[PDB]
Design a protein around this ligand. Structure first.
Ligand SMILES: CCCCCc1ccccc1
Length: 165
């Protein structure tokens, strides 16, 4: 497994504009278009992102291109963030994928909330980190995905993702 397979499992693939778990317009593999309630605003963002008039629908190749851009952005965001970069650099490869997954889902605005978890991950206190990570709106609102990501941090293996092919 790799970060693309992991996030494809967690986000799915949809070629028409849809609403994500928070009710925001999204397309492809978890590509957020806008937090605006306006479908027209989402359609404009989609056209700007793809570079043609899509009328709310894209091809699989286009979805995969947004996905590559979004993964690249998540990783670069971690490397630019003074609080995240040292933790990320301290981690092994599988756990780095769990970190990318979280940033892909939630962005970086709530990093301060995860200060204690980041410290436990940096210290390699995996069971304690796992317990701390679950005390979160993130876990309570998307528990099946949070559990897979947390198990990945706890074990440093892909067991939570092989399980469910
Ligand atoms: C919003 C906070 C996400 C933090 C996820 C993470 C964990 C370890 C290293 C980098 C990023």
């Amino acid at each position: 497994m790799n970060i693309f397979e992991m996030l494809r499992i967690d986000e799915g693939l949809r070629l028409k504009i849809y609403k994500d778990t928070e009710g925001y317009y999204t397309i492809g593999i978890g590509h957020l278009l806008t937090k605006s309630p306006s479908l027209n605003a989402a359609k404009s963002e989609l056209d700007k992102a793809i570079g043609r008039n899509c009328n709310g629908v894209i091809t699989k190749d286009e979805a995969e291109k947004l996905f590559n851009q979004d993964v690249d952005a998540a990783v670069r965001g971690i490397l630019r963030n003074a609080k995240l970069k040292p933790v990320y650099d301290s981690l092994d490869a599988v756990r780095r994928c769990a970190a990318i997954n979280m940033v892909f889902q939630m962005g970086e605005t709530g990093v301060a909330g995860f200060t204690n978890s980041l410290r436990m991950l940096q210290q390699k206190r995996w069971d304690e980190a796992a317990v701390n990570l679950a005390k979160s709106r993130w876990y309570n609102q998307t528990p099946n995905r949070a559990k897979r990501v947390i198990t990945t941090f706890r074990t440093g293996t892909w067991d939570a993702y092989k399980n469910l092919l």
